[PDB]
Structure formats: structure tokens, C-alpha cells
Design a protein around this ligand. Structure first.
Ligand SMILES: Nc1ncnc2c1ncn2[C@@H]1O[C@H](COP(=O)(O)OP(=O)(O)O)[C@@H](O)[C@H]1O
Ligand SMILES: Nc1ncnc2c1ncn2[C@@H]1O[C@H](COP(=O)(O)OP(=O)(O)O)[C@@H](O)[C@H]1O
Ligand SMILES: Nc1ncnc2c1ncn2[C@@H]1O[C@H](COP(=O)(O)OP(=O)(O)O)[C@@H](O)[C@H]1O
Ligand SMILES: Nc1ncnc2c1ncn2[C@@H]1O[C@H](COP(=O)(O)OP(=O)(O)O)[C@@H](O)[C@H]1O
Lengths: 413, 408, 413, 408
């Protein structure tokens, strides 16, 4: 049994060591899901890290436009291609189109590929959009056979190879069966939003991860599924898997997190802001109502803000924003605003997928976290939630329990 | 790398900088969703702001009928064509139709295009309904080749181009392209919502998903960005709060028992400084309190975002200090109560950026001791919140952007 | 920009001034939704009101049967056709069918049309069922082209023209795309009832109304969407957008409405009955239990009854029944029985569509109305609702509030 | 203008006057839904009541087998054919099948029809399954033409005609016609409901929608139209009400605790004047109270409207004074409790028009203090209503068609 690394941000561990070797890998998805991009990033990881030389075969695209494509994420290729990098086989269609006086055997292409390889020492080659080859030549007979002779030749040469091809979940095998291990990238549309996800049906004769898992793009494709106060009466009432403030609207947790972090700045540990609600002037005039000094609390090099409206972005992209925020600036202690907004407008398995993700990341990078949310939690989710909190009546937060014991059980009796 | 503005109202930011440059972008939607409009208005935007001349290729529509189209928006194109700026290329089928005796090399059209551009120096080109040639020519073979050489030739010329093609489906033999917007018209319940989905721009920063839109003079879209408090006054008790000028108030209570309309002195203050549900019958009912309406003057019928934009341009027209929204509950329903309206957050955000003051009325469900606050439930983002309702019963809920007496 | 009036009962205001002019209007719907009828009524409005002479082209139907069709609604045409009315071009198929020895250009038909027009001074022409022309001649090639040359010719002549053509909501463009502004009439079937509705996708280069709206038929097609006690302790408890009696089963509101109107008859203002429940003998033996005299209250020329079982008829047809009841006899004050029945068996957006309709009509034609309904309102709808109402316990109706103040707040304390 | 009766049980009023006249009406349904039956019985109705002779054209069915069909309904047609009244035209395919050497002019059939009519003077014609010729002749071209000239020829002759054709679909290449009934057989849950939908009659008064039906001798359908009170007596307390002879009573209570069966003296009164859940085991249980059943004699298994019509003709058979319905809850379920039964209103209406007295049993859901009254909830239309059930607890709900003591 064989295997080869890729190190696409978080894909490899699902394949438990990457793609098969000496075997043909087919990648299929609906138009607009970054198949070509997957090929590019794959091979660029290869040549940059492993110096595993590459061949990028393109039918749909023009080279100049594929380089101007990839240059978006900050990868400069042709100047570095002069190093003997990756070689782009141009299989873009002759614009004048072609006429036929008989049938063809696409020996020219495959032999061209193998000279290109045996010149470039390449052990890795990607191939963009075979369906275009089916829509290039209107003879759907032969292209099957000669794509097959290609993939077989690549299996002989033992090189790692990739194929990209074009309704997602339903009957999806496109039109080109003919391959030996298959990744299907689908982005599903639900309600009025978009979830980019990767399914691996199975990798034949090799360990594979069970099921489909959502992803997003950065400089290279990412997802990582699988894991595994100070102030106030503070501790008097209390005696980390993050704190929870679950409360009726106007939860005023704003207080608790604001000076949860403000003390943090006092003691010198690093703090950060991550708020998805109020315009942060009102965030700290509601905080400047306390008499604290937030704009004075940030002589830079200490905290960062720029808020973000929840609905304006998909949830796990927010997850990435704060992932590499907390990665860029390494806070000791931070707090998260209004889980409530993320609690609705979203199928609660998405929202809880998310909350398990963030809770898991924060709990064991031993970073301390807070979380606020407002009730009508009525999303019912229990578990790993740690600390929770004559005429008129005022607000009275108090705790059940923490850790494994101690605090106050009874409220403000 | 690179991208080009459209400056059509609210699309440019969805594409994170407008349409791509030197590449042909395909625009597709089901018939009757204003693709042609997007194209026309695209070239008109180009030419009016940038003096970037345009070539509009039209099969389906008739040229003179495209101008009689455009005069609805109040724009004179024939004057613009004589200005030597925009050219409407007539590629409409001769009504006499076609007879066929062989295969085609569709060079004629493309050469016509490139002569038109290289004469007008044009940097913008729209192409309305390539699908029409498919409804003209029964050969799905060659048109592949000639569309590809067209779009490619245009990329040699480097001009930005648009192709229009004919619910949640694919592209009906239009062949993949290198950047694609699919604007879809949705039919839900018993009303119809026009939305724009942008599928892909390859190698470029892009916004996530489908986004609702409506039409004005040009297409309008809804993206997503972002005395210490002069208020009413109200006698007896005079604001325990007041409601900050940059705030919004929430009165949630069973029934529309708020007929008293607290907005009465919310407005009285407005007029005080001099600054500015039959609302006729309610305003002989408002003169029951003793206010001076006759001297004060010196829902299903519209889609939600039509309410949103109409009021956008009322408040744009007259610069209100403080106004209120009547029976938001009514706007919450007629839509069935599980269809969750983002909407209110949008306008709320808007209130935040122009120091405009808003009040909000809404009717709550049952009566006594409902732990449930509001029907489909308006929570935070609302600055000022309050209750309502043995007698009628006012109370304050919870705020700490200020503090005071917790009522009753 | 151009426009032309039609005055079909309530259609024009959606088109904000009617159909386009000098442009081809296509009308499509599933079989059995009154497309042909729409054409007929259109042109009959034209010639009767505007003296805009007309041409009715028919492929499917035979003239004699189209006149016997239209004569159902009380329109007598052929005798009036002698006036130089509308001209029916007979394009009914030769029953013997036809044989083919080559292809045809349908010049005969179009030229016939234009002579007919230039003889009849016509500015308006309707055309019934083009799909039949596709199912008349089995050559689906040419009929496209020559229908196109027809519609184009009509655009040249500047005449207003209409085309009728044959699964409703889903993929509906029939088979004949070829037109320049489109009305789609669909009747949907839900549960076990039928809703006739009009959708206008868009009218090209012209104002159009946003969305689809239900309709029914009378003498001509109708719909109008878009708008915009006395006795008892009476007012002691109270101190018009209609009254509401919402109550537990056996709401006995029957009392309150019965002599709500009976006093009305006393004072002389006009009253009417609109009951959708009990056989009206029991209606007024439950009322003759009060000692009142209903059959004696109606010496005719005062009130009218004839009850109607809710389920036996679609809701907005009831709406029309009372619309032209209250229009025929002009009541001052009336009451409506058992909104409860209409509250269930119906998707509540239909029921509330309805209730907003009737409430709106009654409130500002300044007619006074009452409404009874029984709870298990639990349909939750608030707003424009005005006035609402040791061992055993009896019934006790009392009010919250009315207008903007006064009445009794407290019940029968 | 004009229309002609069918006098088939309950269809005529759905069409607001029966089938159209001088026009060919198409009858379509999925195979196995009794279209042929509608046709046969149509012509038999015509001929038996009006002595309006009929021509029945049959492809699918065999003539002798159509008579052995009809003998199920107890009707002798062969006697009617020899009476010189009805003629069953055999257009069944010769089992030996067909060979083809060219195109057809299907004049033979039509000329046969018109000879048959002009001989029998017939005014009624049925045509069962034109679709059969489509399952006979593989040319979908000409049959268009010959069906059209058939139906048209029949309209010259002015006779009323019916065409039968072969779930919620269209017409499977049958071509549009000028008035159409689609009778559909529905499959829901795990039972099947036959309904008749009537799609259109052009230029004519018509009823709205789909309407459920069942079969008897002829098809039956369910349209929609429309001592001061001798009752039980019951000792101790003797009717605080009594329940009027034209009334209906409602006893709603948790469980079938009404085993006491108030109907006991509701019936005792019936016998008193002399006028007329194992109901065997319940009637050794009824003899536990001391009544005299042995001397008294001097659900899923059937569809709802089969219960309705069966009881329609029991009450038609025996003219009851007063009878009651056992455990209506049971009829409310076995159907899943959201499937709302109109049904009970229908029979209720019926009770109103023949002075028949009815009582109704039903079991309610939980127990104490349910603001909810009845499960799927029976409200008004019920005249007399009552409650049931620390001990058992009778109480009266609310009526003012009379007044009395509000119980307990
Ligand atoms: N900066 C960026 N941010 C987000 N997405 C990007 C960015 N640059 C490129 N993309 C995405 O890359 C995708 C290109 O892949 P795709 O559309 O599937 O083309 P192909 O089929 O050739 O792979 C586009 O859909 C685009 O949304
Ligand atoms: N008063 C108006 N209001 C809204 N839209 C208008 C108006 N006048 C013209 N238009 C636009 O002109 C466009 C013509 O384009 P059209 O061909 O309808 O696009 P599509 O190809 O989607 O049918 C219409 O879609 C419509 O949006
Ligand atoms: N008095 C009437 N009441 C209700 N509907 C009627 C009346 N007279 C005619 N109609 C309706 O008119 C319709 C005729 O239009 P349709 O069936 O669509 O035929 P076409 O396709 O030729 O327009 C019929 O469906 C019929 O229900
Ligand atoms: N005892 C019976 N009960 C009910 N229906 C009967 C009985 N005997 C005969 N029939 C009727 O005879 C009809 C023959 O017509 P059929 O060909 O079944 O119509 P379809 O074309 O819908 O299958 C049956 O549909 C059935 O309704």
C-alpha cells in the first residue's frame, strides 16, 4: 500500500497521509468550486516544499490567465518557473476551432505529457477539466479511451496525478467514470447562503476519512475539522473551557466581558476584541458609561477591533478570521460577542459544529475565552459549557457550578 | 489581478470591486429577470461616468425599442450615439427569417464587433442573449467555437465584456466561462423576490452568496457593511431613560395598544427644534389628543426591500431628525412567521450611520408572564427597549448604556 | 415609453396603465384558466368603451362556439358585430385535416390579418392558442419564424396585440418564446381546492406590478389586490375599523350582532345579513329566543340573507359575493358570521390576505362592520383589530380598549 | 348556453347542470378509476330516464364483458339493445392484431358512428379510451386529425358525447378539447381516495375544485348545499337544557367514560313513542343497566365517505327518529390527527334537512383544565354541547339557543 503527502491546510489528515501514489486521482465538482485551484495549490505545495516538479495541463484556461489566476493569492510562478519549477502544458483550444476529416488518437497530447515529465523530472502532474475535452471534440467515444490510456500511462510511470471535472449531491459522476480514486468538491446552497465542502467517497485500497466536511479558501485552500473576571465581586461568587454568559435580552454581559478583558490589559497579558454587533463607538460608550478608557486602553500593540456583522459573512469564515487573528497576535485572554446572532438563521448543527470548533481551539491552546449570548441557551446544548450566569425586579446573575466544585450555589438570597 | 467598477447601485461591492477586466463575464438568469437591463445600464454607467465608450450587441431586443426601453429611466442614448460614444449593434434576426444551405463560419459578427470597437475605441461591451442565436441557428456545434473565439478575441482587445443567457439550474448549453454571475428571480409562497447570486470570479476577492435586490433608475441591491439626549418629553413622567439621538426605541406589547403613539411628542420635539393603520383616519384620531395636525403641515402592496429602499430615499429626500415605524409586526407577517426578516438589522445599521433617529412599534403575542419576549423575537441591536400590556402596564426591560428606575 | 388602458376589473392598476402599445403581449397558462376569455373580455372592453375595433383570431375554437362561449356572461356580439364591431378571423382547422407536398410560408394568414385590420380600422387584436398552430402543423421549425413575422408586423403597425398559449409554476415558457411582454395566468391546486391567480413576470421597458395575485371570474375577469351595538349596556362599557368578537366556542356573539343590526333597522339605516353557518331558521330561533322578529324585521327592501356554507365555495369568491352584495344594496351597518371556519382549512396567509381585504374595504367606504369568531384569536393576528370581547362560572365579555381611549378596562369586577 | 343533465348521483350539481350539450366533453383519469363506468352509466341514465337512445363505443372492453360488467349493477342492456334503444359499438381490436402497409384515413369508424346515431336517432354517445387506438396504432400524427373530425362531426349532429382517456398530470397526447372533467384517484398515507375534479366547461357556470366520491349502483359523489323538545329523560336530573329534535348533542370528555351511553334513554324515548366498541359485547354490557335489548328487537375497514354514504342509506332505509355516533374520535384518527375531517359538518347539515335527530360521542385528550376543547376541535355548528371528565365531572359548556343552569 502506498501514500503521498500534500499539506493543503487541513486536507491531508482526512486522507491520513495524502493522495495515493502511482494511481489516478479524479476531482469533480460543480462549476465555481475551485477544482483548478485545488490542482494549482496541490502542485505548488509539491514543488515548493518537496521540490516535487510538476505539470499543469490546461484545456479550459489560457496560461497567462492561469498565472494571473494564481497570482491573486501571492504566488509568482513564471519567474520562479525559470528555475525549472512546474510546466504548464498548453491544451487551450485553437480559437479558430478545428475541422475533422476523420477520427483521432490523442497520442500527441499524452506523449507530449510524458516528454514534459521526463524532461522536468516531475513526479506530480495535475490536469484541468476533462469534460472540456469532451466538449472540445464532439466525439464522446474515443476521449474516454484515450483519457484511459493517459491515466493508465501515469499509473505505469508511478507519478501522482490529478484530474478535474464538472447538480452536486445528486447523480454526480459527471460523464467521465474511468478513474481510480475520487474526491468530490461540492458547494451547497441552503436558504440564501453557501457552504463549500469536500466529500471523499472513498480512496480505493487505502485509508480515507468518513464523510463530507465544509471548507473555505485563503492563500491556499483550508479546513481543519477533526480535533482530538478579575474585577467585580469576581471569585467571591466563584471560589479553561471558556465562560458562558447566557441571559435574557439586555444580558449586560457587556459589563462582565468589558472589564473581564480590561483587567487583563492591566495585568499585562495580551487581550483582543472580537465583537459581532454594535458599532464599536456605542460598544465603548456603553463601555465609556462605566468610566473605563477603551480608546485609551489601546495604544495599539495590545488589542485590535474592527467589528463584523454576522450575517455579512458565512460562519466558518468568521471562524478563520479569528483563527488567524488569535494566531497573528497571540492573545492570552479574549471574549466573543453575541453568539445569539449565530444561534439563528442557521441550522443548529452548523452553529454547534462551529461552537465545538472554537471552544475546542480555545480550550487547548490554553487561551482563556468568554462567550455572551441572549435567550428569547434555548438551543439546549449542554455539556462543555463551563461557567454560566415588591413591584419591580433588577438583574441578578449567579452561578450553578464550575470546574468540579466551589462557588456560590444559591443566588443573591 | 485588476478588476473594473460598474458603479451600479450596490453591485460593485458584492463583486468586491466590480466586474473583472480583460475577461468576459457571463450574466445569466431565467427569462424576465432583467439581465438585459444589467447589460444596458452597465454600458451606460461606463460611458456616463468614465466616458468609456460602449458597444451593445442585441439579438432579442430591437434597437429603437431598447431606446424606448431606456427612456423609462430618463436616458437619451440616441443623443449619446450621435455624441459618438455608445453604439447599439443590431444583431436582431431579420423577421423574414433564415434559410440554410450549409455550415457557417460566423466570422461576420465578430469582425463587425471588433471593427465597431476599434472604431469607437470602446472598452465596454454587452452582449444580450447569445441564447437567441441558439433560438435562431439549430447548430449547437459551431456556436461553441465562435463564442469561444469571440470572447477570446475580446480578451486580446482586453475590453470588459458581458454575455447574457437564459429556475435554479445551470446554463442551458452556454459552455463554461471564466467568471459568472447568476441573477435569480425566486418564487416563494405567493410573492416573488429578485436576488443576485454571483457564482465565481477566478483568481479574485469575492462576496459570499445570494443577495436580494429591486429596481429603480438603475438596479438597486442590498449588500452588508459596518439636554444629553433630545427626545419626546411626555408629561407626568418625563423619560426615566433620554433615548439618545443615535439610538432606537423598542415598545413591545400585546396588541397595538400603543395607539397613544409615543411618537406624538417624539415628533413634537422634532417640530419644537423646527426639524422635520389608515394614517388619514389615525390623524383625526391624533387630533383627539389635542395635537395640531392640520397646522402641522406648513404593506402587501410592496415587497420588503421595496419598503426598505422607498424609505431609504424618503429619508434621503427630506433629512428627518426622528421618525417611527408603524406596526412592524404587520411587516413581520403576510410572509408567514417563520420567514425570518434580517431586514430590521439592515435599517438599524443604517440608523447608526447618519445620526438619524428611529422609533419602532410592534405588537406582541399573548398577554401575561410570557418569558418569550417578541414573536419572531427582536433581541439586542435594539438600543432602547420597553414593555407594555387589571390595568395597562408599562415597564422598562434591560439596558446599561444608561441606568435608572426599573419600572413598576 | 408607451402604454394602453384595458379596464379589466382590477388588472390595469397592476400594469399601472395597462398593456404596452405597438408591442406584442403573450399570455400563457395551463388549459382551463380563461386565456381565451381574457382575450375576448380585453377586446370587448376595447370596442365597447374606447371603440378600439378588434380582431379575434381563433385556431382552437369555432366562431359559433366562441360567440356561444362569450354569450354566457351577457355579451351579444354578432348582431352588434353588424355595427362593424370586432372581426373573428376563422383559423379553425379544416376537419378533413391537410396533406403536405412541401413546406409552407403562412403568408396567407398574416396578410389576411392585416387586410382585416386595415378594413376594420382596428387598433387591437387578440390571438387564441398558438401552441395549437404548433399542433396543427407538425413542422415545429417554420411556425416559430412566421409567428415571429406576425408579431413583428403587428409591432410595425403599432397595434396592441395579444397571444394565448398553453405544469404552471415550474418550467413555463410553453414552447413559444418569441414574444416581447408576458402575462402568465396559473391556477394552483392545493390540498383540495383551486386558486386562480395572475403572475406578471415583467413587462419589458415599462412599469409592472411586483408579483403574483389571485383572481376570480364574473361578467369579465376580476380581482382587486392593492389598497392604499346600540342596545344592551352598549357604550357604558365602551364610553370604524369594525368590531371583533373573539371568544370560546358558543361565543354567543350571535346576540351581540343580532341586535347590533336590529337596532340598526330600528333607527332606519340600511342593514344586511352575511352568515356562513347555521340554517337561518335556527339563526333566528336562536334569535327568536330573544323575542325579536327577524322574518318580521324583513318586509324586504331592508335586509337580505341566503346563507352560504364556507367550505362549499372558495374564500375570495365569498369576498366577491359580499362585495357586490354590499355594492348592490348599500348597507350602512352589517356583521359577519364565523370567521372561525375560514380560519382553518386554509393557509393562514390566505385567510389574513382575505381579512385585510374585507377590513380595508369596510373601514374606508365608511361602512360599519362586525366580525364573530371562535377560539379553540389563536391565529395570533393583532393590529387593525379594534374592539374585542363558587362552583360554576358564567360568560363574561369585556373590553381592553377602543379608538385611542375610554371604556372599561376592568371586566365585570 | 344550454347544458344537459346526467342525473348520476351527485355529479350533475358539480357541473351546475350536468354535461354540456352539442359539445364533446372529455373524461380522463389514471387507469383503474372508473372512467368507463362514468360513460356506461351516463348512457344508461340518458336512456332509462329520458328514453334518450345511446351509442357506446368501446375499444378496451369486450361488449359481452361490458354487459357482464353491468349485470353487477343489476341492469339488463341486451334487453335494452333489443328494445332498440342503446347500441354497444364494438371497436375492440381484433385479437389477431394488425399489420400495416400505409397511412390511414380513419373514415370507417366515424361513418360507422354517424350511421349508428342517424339510425338510432341517438342523442348520447360515450367513447371509452381513445387512448386504446394509441395503444393500437403507432401513428400519433393522423389520430389528431381524425379525433378532431370525429368530435366535430358529432357537434354537427349536436349529440352530447364523452371521451375517456388515461397521477396528477395532464392528458397524455390527447389534445385539448372544449370541456374537460378529470376524475382522479388519490393515494395518501396508506389508503386511497377517489375524487372527481372538473377542470373546465367553456362559457358556462361551474363548481370549484376536487370533490370526493365513492361507488354504489351508479357513482355517488359528495357536493355541498344549504314537551317542547322530546329527548332521553335521564333520572335524578332530567335535562337542564331538552335537546331539540332538530338539534345534535355533543359530549366531549377524556376517555370513553361515556360507556354509560346517554343514548340509552335517547333511544328509550324513541321506543317510548314507538319510533325506531364491539356492539355485541357492549350489548350484554347494556343489559347491565337493566334495559331490555333481547326484547328491544321486535372503521379502518371502510373509507370515511363509505361510512357517510352507508349511513346515508341506513337512515334512508329505516327513517330513524334519533340515533348516535359511537367514538367519533376513532373516525378522526387512523387517518393521523392533522388530516382535518370536513365530513362531520356534512352529515350535520344533513341532520338539519329531514328532522333526523343525532347524538355524537367523542373522547377528548388529556384531563384537567385544558383550555383546548376538542382534539382536532369541533366548535360551533354543534347545537348542544357538554363536558365530562377526585370524581367524574359533568358540565355544560355554552349555549344561548336556550338558557339554564351552568353546571357545577
Ligand atoms: N481572494 C479570493 N477570495 C475568495 N475566493 C477566491 C479568491 N480568489 C479566487 N477565489 C475563488 O476561486 C474560484 C476559482 O475556482 P472555480 O471558480 O472553481 O474555477 P475552476 O473551475 O477553474 O477551478 C472562484 O470561484 C473564486 O470565488
Ligand atoms: N419602470 C421600470 N421599472 C423596473 N424595471 C424597468 C422599468 N422600465 C424598464 N425596466 C427594465 O428593462 C428591462 C428589460 O430587460 P429584460 O429583457 O426584461 O431582461 P430579461 O432578459 O431578464 O427578461 C426589464 O427587465 C426591466 O428590469
Ligand atoms: N358562469 C361562469 N362561472 C364560472 N366560470 C366560468 C363561467 N363561464 C365560463 N367560465 C370559465 O371560463 C373558462 C374558459 O376558459 P378556459 O377553460 O381557459 O378555455 P380557454 O383555454 O379557451 O380560455 C372555463 O374554465 C370556465 O370555468
Ligand atoms: N361491485 C362494484 N363496485 C364498484 N364498482 C363496480 C362494481 N362492479 C363494476 N364496477 C365498475 O365497473 C367499472 C369498469 O370501468 P374501468 O375500466 O375499471 O374504468 P377505468 O378505465 O378507470 O379502469 C369499474 O371501474 C368499476 O367502477
Amino acid at each position: 500500500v502506498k501514500k503521498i503527502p500534500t499539506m493543503i491546510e487541513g486536507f491531508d489528515d482526512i486522507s491520513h497521509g495524502g493522495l495515493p501514489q502511482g494511481r489516478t486521482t479524479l476531482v469533480s465538482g460543480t462549476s465555481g468550486t475551485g477544482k483548478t485551484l485545488f490542482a494549482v495549490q496541490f502542485l505548488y505545495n509539491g514543488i515548493t516544499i518537496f521540490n516535487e516538479p510538476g505539470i499543469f495541463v490546461t484545456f479550459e484556461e489560457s496560461p497567462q490567465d492561469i498565472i494571473k489566476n494564481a497570482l491573486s493569492f501571492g504566488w509568482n510562478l513564471q519567474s520562479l518557473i525559470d528555475q525549472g519549477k512546474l510546466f504548464i502544458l498548453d491544451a487551450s483550444p485553437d480559437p479558430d476551432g478545428q475541422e475533422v476529416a476523420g477520427d483521432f488518437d490523442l497520442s500527441a497530447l499524452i506523449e507530449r505529457i510524458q516528454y514534459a515529465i521526463r524532461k522536468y523530472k516531475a513526479t506530480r502532474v495535475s490536469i484541468d477539466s476533462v469534460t472540456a475535452v469532451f466538449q472540445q471534440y464532439d466525439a464522446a467515444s474515443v476521449v474516454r479511451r484515450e483519457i484511459f490510456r493517459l491515466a493508465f500511462r501515469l499509473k505505469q510511470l508511478g507519478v501522482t496525478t490529478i484530474m478535474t471535472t464538472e447538480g452536486p449531491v445528486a447523480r454526480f459522476g459527471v460523464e467521465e467514470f474511468v478513474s481510480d480514486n475520487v474526491v468530490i468538491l461540492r458547494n451547497v446552497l441552503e436558504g440564501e447562503r453557501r457552504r463549500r465542502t469536500v466529500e471523499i467517497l472513498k480512496l480505493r485500497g487505502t485509508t480515507h476519512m468518513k464523510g463530507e466536511y465544509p471548507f473555505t479558501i485563503n492563500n491556499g485552500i483550508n479546513i481543519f475539522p477533526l480535533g482530538a473576571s478579575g474585577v467585580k465581586t469576581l471569585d467571591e461568587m466563584c471560589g479553561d473551557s471558556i465562560i458562558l454568559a447566557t441571559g435574557a435580552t439586555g444580558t449586560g454581559k457587556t459589563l462582565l466581558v468589558s472589564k473581564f478583558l480590561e483587567t487583563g490589559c492591566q495585568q499585562g497579558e495580551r487581550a483582543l476584541l472580537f465583537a459581532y454587533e454594535e458599532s464599536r463607538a456605542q460598544l465603548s460608550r456603553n463601555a465609556s458609561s462605566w468610566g473605563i478608557d477603551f480608546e485609551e486602553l489601546e495604544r495599539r500593540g495590545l488589542l485590535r477591533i474592527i467589528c463584523a456583522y454576522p450575517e455579512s459573512a458565512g460562519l466558518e469564515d468568521h471562524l478563520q478570521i479569528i483563527k488567524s487573528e488569535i494566531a497573528d497576535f497571540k492573545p492570552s485572554r479574549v471574549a466573543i460577542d453575541s453568539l445569539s446572532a449565530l444561534a439563528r438563521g442557521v441550522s443548529n448543527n452548523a452553529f454547534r459544529q462551529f461552537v465545538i470548533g472554537v471552544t475546542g481551539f480555545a480550550k487547548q491552546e490554553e487561551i482563556t475565552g468568554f462567550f455572551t449570548n441572549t435567550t428569547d441557551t434555548e438551543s439546549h446544548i449542554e455539556t462543555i459549557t463551563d461557567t454560566i450566569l415588591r413591584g419591580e425586579m433588577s438583574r441578578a446573575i449567579n452561578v450553578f457550578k464550575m470546574r468540579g466544585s466551589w462557588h456560590d450555589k444559591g443566588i443573591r438570597e
